[PDB]
Amino acid sequence: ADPKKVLDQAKDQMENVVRTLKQELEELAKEARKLDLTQSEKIELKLRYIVAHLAAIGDIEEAIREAKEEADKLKRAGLVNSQQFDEFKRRLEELHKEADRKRADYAEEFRNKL
Amino acid sequence: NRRYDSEFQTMLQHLQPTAENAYEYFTKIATSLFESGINWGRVVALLGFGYRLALHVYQHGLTGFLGQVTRFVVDFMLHH
């Protein structure tokens, strides 16, 4: 039950990251609707998108790292056995695959708008 | 640890960088990213982007030269 709490910390943290990405991609799409948008300003929107998408990747990679270290502490103390520990990393990977799908779907629909 | 290659690739195809502007585009990306915050994952993601941007720019030039070389050799076997 204690690893279940650590997984809830990672799930909420990865979802705030994906929402931070969502809200900034909306802000970039509004500025892409500007009238008389120059080709240079369109490039500056592309660069700002890559910055946001990289931040979303690295911050999810940051939440995953902290969750694995919080479980490494539990394993060394002895609160989780090998079966419970290996179940943690298995369900931590599905949350990671899920955050990746949502992150990619937001960037994919934004690219299609621009 | 390959989960981000499809995303890295789609980003590079959206940006459409060249050999001349890739480093300028990269330094602007790197600066805006680290000015908003630096952590382990962002340094890994940026370096991951950097390396693949280099491969994207230079594989573009590689397939071109291979096309010229191959088309030349078969052209000489065609007319001569």
Numbering used by the authors:
A (entry chain B): 2 to 115
B (entry chain A): 86 to 165
Original authors' sentences:
BCL-2 protein family members BAK and BAX are the gatekeepers of mitochondrial apoptosis. Homooligomers of BAK and BAX form pores in the mitochondrial outer membrane (MOM) and release apoptotic factors into the cytosol, committing the cell to destruction. We use computational protein design to generate high affinity binders of BAK and BAX with greater than 100-fold specificity for their target. Both binders activate their targets when at low concentration, driving pore formation, but inhibit membrane permeabilization when in excess.
We solved a structure of the BAK:αBAK2 complex in the P1 space group, diffracting to 2.9 Å, with four BAK:αBAK2 heterodimers in the asymmetric unit. The four heterodimeric complexes in the asymmetric unit are similar (between 0.15- and 0.29-Å Cα root mean square deviation (RMSD), 193 to 195 atoms aligned from a total of 197). BAK is in an unlatched conformation with α6 to α8 helices dissociated from the BAK monomer core. The unlatched α6 and α7 helices form a tetrameric BAK crystal contact in the structures, with their hydrophobic faces packing against α4 and α5 helices from a neighboring BAK monomer. No electron density is seen for the BAK α1 and α2 helices. The SDS–polyacrylamide gel electrophoresis (SDS-PAGE) of the crystals shows that the BAK construct is truncated, but only in the crystals and not in solution. The design model of BAK:αBAK2 is very close to the crystal structure, with an all-atom RMSD of 3.2 Å and Cα RMSD of 2.6 Å after alignment of BAK α3 to α5 helices (residues 90 to 141) and αBAK2. The position of BAK helix α3 relative to helices α4 and α5 is shifted by approximately one helical turn in the crystal structure compared to the design model, which was based on NMR structure 2M5B. Despite the α3 shift, the αBAK2 h1-h4 BH3-mimetic residues occupy similar positions at the BAK interface relative to BAK α4 and α5 helices. In conclusion, αBAK2 binds as designed in the BAK BH3-binding groove and can bind to BAK in a partially unfolded, unlatched conformation.
